[PDB]
Amino acid sequence: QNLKSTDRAVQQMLDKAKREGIQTVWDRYEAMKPQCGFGETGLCCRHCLQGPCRINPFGDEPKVGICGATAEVIVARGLDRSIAAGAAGHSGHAKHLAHTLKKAVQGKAASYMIKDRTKLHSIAKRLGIPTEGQKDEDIALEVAKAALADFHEKDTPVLWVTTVLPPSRVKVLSAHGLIPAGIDHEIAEIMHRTSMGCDADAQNLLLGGLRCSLADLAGCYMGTDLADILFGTPAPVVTESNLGVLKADAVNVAVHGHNPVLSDIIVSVSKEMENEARAAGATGINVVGICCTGNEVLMRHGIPACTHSVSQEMAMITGALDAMILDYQCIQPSVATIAECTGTTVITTMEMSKITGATHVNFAEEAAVENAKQILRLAIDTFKRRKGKPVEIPNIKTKVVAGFSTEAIINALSKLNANDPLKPLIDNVVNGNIRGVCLFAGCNNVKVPQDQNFTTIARKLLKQNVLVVATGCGAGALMRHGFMDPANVDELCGDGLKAVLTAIGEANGLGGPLPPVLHMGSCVDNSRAVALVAALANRLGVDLDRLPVVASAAEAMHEKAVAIGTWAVTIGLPTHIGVLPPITGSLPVTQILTSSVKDITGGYFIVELDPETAADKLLAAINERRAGLGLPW
Amino acid sequence: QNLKSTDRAVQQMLDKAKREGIQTVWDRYEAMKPQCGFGETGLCCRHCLQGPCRINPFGDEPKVGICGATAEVIVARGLDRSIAAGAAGHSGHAKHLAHTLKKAVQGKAASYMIKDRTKLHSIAKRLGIPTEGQKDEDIALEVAKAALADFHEKDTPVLWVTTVLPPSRVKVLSAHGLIPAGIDHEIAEIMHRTSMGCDADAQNLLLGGLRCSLADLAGCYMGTDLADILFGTPAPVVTESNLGVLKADAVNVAVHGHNPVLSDIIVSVSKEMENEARAAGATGINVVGICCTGNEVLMRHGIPACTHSVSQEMAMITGALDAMILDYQCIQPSVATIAECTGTTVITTMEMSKITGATHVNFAEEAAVENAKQILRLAIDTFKRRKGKPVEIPNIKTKVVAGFSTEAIINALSKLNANDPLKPLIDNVVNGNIRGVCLFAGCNNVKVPQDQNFTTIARKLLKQNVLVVATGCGAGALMRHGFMDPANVDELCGDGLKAVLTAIGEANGLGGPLPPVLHMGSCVDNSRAVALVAALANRLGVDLDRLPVVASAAEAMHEKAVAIGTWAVTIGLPTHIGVLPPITGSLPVTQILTSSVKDITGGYFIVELDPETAADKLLAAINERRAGLGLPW
């Protein structure tokens, strides 16, 4: 079971599902091989009823789509559509948060409120929204209206793009017409231009896709900002991760998905429902996290991460998972089917995200508490049915220090320098103690043994004094293998990095160093690493395509991840992706994305499937940026 | 060449392309067989990097996607995405027209203006925009701002849905949450919910898709209204169609695509460029039409339709086609490749729709004339290169009477009854002289011998006294076979229909009958047939799902067509489609779309690939609606 997952709890539960006869994602993957060469290479198109059209990667006819579409065009249209669908997911989540905020500050959802006034003021001022003499509800109402405004055309471009990148980057992007005019506008225009009989030039297509990926960036940044206003800016926390955070003698309730609007209230209501949890023989309600909603409650409240991504079903396999509460995105629909064998109540809540088989509780921000209890009651109900029956929880769990928002990191650096908090980080970059910065992002993928690319690449980079920050299921993969535990700095980190992590730690009231990897939150919280990197650029007066920053979607899978990789390339970063995107059917497009895009944005894609090789190329790019600053490496 | 096209000019040019060695769409289709069963049935999914996932239609594993997605879900997600991409095309076109209007009435594009004040006033009042005491530029500015507003969320739903259907239909749709909140909002939400890990229930998905198809309806209706304000409401015209409208001794310039913003100005500038056309040995500039832009200039100015859809390349094969001026949608990118053999200047103009190989002229509404000349000069330039060299134009052309907007039709009926213009049409329905109304819509498809389903089904329906109206390439297929020629009423139409077409004709100052098919315009002008059908419903006080109206996408192909079929079902119509949509891999979804949807909207899909069988089922549905009114049949 090692070619499936490098996670030991996951291997134990895989053995269980094998003997109990429950189909897993790896099983469905095994029944899918050998996969379609056309699909994998991108040479498949079904945008009209004359198709499907396939193009042979190598050989005789068909050399071209029925309508005449070349391989360059088929590949670039497919990729543009994945960028747009990612942008739709991130943007829908942030749009929901903006409606939540407007409802709140107009007295419509008393379960919600402004929990971070500093953040709201810094945002409203980033946007040129007047603060002084204006009351908070009016300020937040303005901020929310602006968020909603960024989804359509208007007098200004998308503010959550133009006001969050260094103006030099904004100028570089505006010269090539890359600035989104509206988030949903860009999504619709992608769907227009990639449909049959429209755009038929690969450069033109890919430029459209770069623009749409900045629309996605805006969705991420909006979601981060709005969720921080609404639920508090993450600050460092200590919790634990892996399946061992589940307890047999408690009501175990998993928050799973991406949108914290629901699950943060779940977290807060669960505490008061203890009185009722006891009357069923439970120590209480044990709220754990799966995927990105889980990372959100782990960043804000120290909620332990139970599992992530490709191994989410393994949670239910323990037999101790009483309630799985979904919102949307990255939920394997198999959980519904699986719940009949493991005894779990699987509950959907968002009306555009139901799974056939599941129970649906219609959540709305206005009646939050009334539904939260309704769900948790059901959770305790299921704990009745499984009282005194054999659970198998692998006793595997790790110590996780997380909650490193960009604000937390700037506060952490301030204790070394109160009026120039970025100065110490810059100094240790300049003298080699930090070789560069690498952001691990994205999901697990069934094609890659779970966490293998993440942990391998992280191992080389840490041993090379690269500051590593991580989000979403990247942060999940690293924390489940010890990389968010300060006690592992010694083994993992090279001497200089060790020194800096130690200096900051001892200077922040601990006598111990920061974790070896900085957990920065969920998928939209990739925006946080932009905020930091932008700040870095600004404090040094250069564009991002000169900083020794890189990014790695080491085991990418979802369309969100493609949009994210593309907007890391678009804001200047060298961007590795550890699974094939479907571009290898076109050398011109591959060449545009790994090279000639260098000439437009300074970023570029690094396609490398071997994790050791990928760490080498990532260090090579970091070191090239060093050499461009005149820096030693 | 008869299994390719039932059009005789097209067969002549197919023989030419065969001997000259030019690859055609039928050739690329031949090199694509046998096509992918997975694709054709809808059991293929590539929404994430773990795919591609295929599901065997019948047999052993794979029975399910890697993530767990059942076949019901894969099919409904694919179909939702095609609905959304259609909606994106229609909505982008209308959004462009709304920007054109705002620019015009703010003194920004003097090449454009209000050419129909009656239409603008009737629209502004349909929307509750105040007219009296307000000047026209302010009224149109308000109308345009409202159009732009319907693309995003706001205080009201999409006005170009709620104010154009009978309120009973609006209530029926609002009860099931089917009313769009924003056009691009619905598109984005479709892309969100159909991506991996989100909506996983087929009914929930298909309801989302119904809503998105009404967003597409709104795009069509907006485009029709704005283009009518801007360029005039079509009134009956006489012109000709088929390749024989090309002339060897003139500069032949084809307007091709969907968006008339450019090509209407092309039409108007071409007349004055005669002085320059003569100085090259040309009788002038011979502007013809291809596809829907062509239908727009055929409805408004009597521009002859040269060809349509699957046979567009055949135009260039004559050797007489000097300039092909594209905007976007339904342009086979092969034309670029083909232009090097036929000597045609292929010119793209829209910046999100370029074909590698073509010349791009950057059009903008503000400098319209300056670019139009630039393009036409090039056209005349090419007429120099081909002076005194062998063209083969098939001398095949037909007489076309068209320009039957809903206003033109209501005016035509008024001469029988001035104060109750719909009364005579209703009376002849009620007494059997009109059995029902059938709208032919959509494109040609390479899988069907060109025009065969259209002409066969039209033949049965006309012989059964069914009023037939037609749009886009449906209207193209019928007019190229004589169905828009009054001289064919005798042969085609049954006695009662003949009588009504004759009465209206003789009463409209001709002594001859209306054509056998009412040409109502382009793809967005499907909206016109809604306006009529709605008016009919209103004049009778019933919902559309009780009128003997049906619709037929007899040879559908593009994603636009799927969105259109779905919103004909959603507004109540029985809707035949003469090519397989990719739904047959799921009986539950097929059943939802051909039956259980009856219980939600009153419409339903009729999947029938045999055109005679389809005419039978279309008559059966018309006659069932008759029986529901208590009517004889």
Ligand code: SF4
């Ligand atoms: S758009 Fe072109 S390549 Fe794609 S399915 Fe249709 S005919 Fe084939």
Ligand code: SF4
């Ligand atoms: S979303 Fe599911 S079915 Fe579609 S490609 Fe990904 S794993 Fe396969």
Ligand SMILES: [Fe+3]
């Ligand atoms: Fe995840």
Ligand SMILES: [Fe+3]
């Ligand atoms: Fe995630």
Ligand SMILES: [Fe+3]
């Ligand atoms: Fe993910």
Ligand SMILES: [Fe+3]
């Ligand atoms: Fe993610």
Ligand SMILES: [Fe+3]
């Ligand atoms: Fe067409």
Ligand SMILES: [Fe+3]
């Ligand atoms: Fe058309």
Ligand SMILES: [Fe+3]
């Ligand atoms: Fe078409």
Ligand SMILES: [Fe+3]
């Ligand atoms: Fe069309």
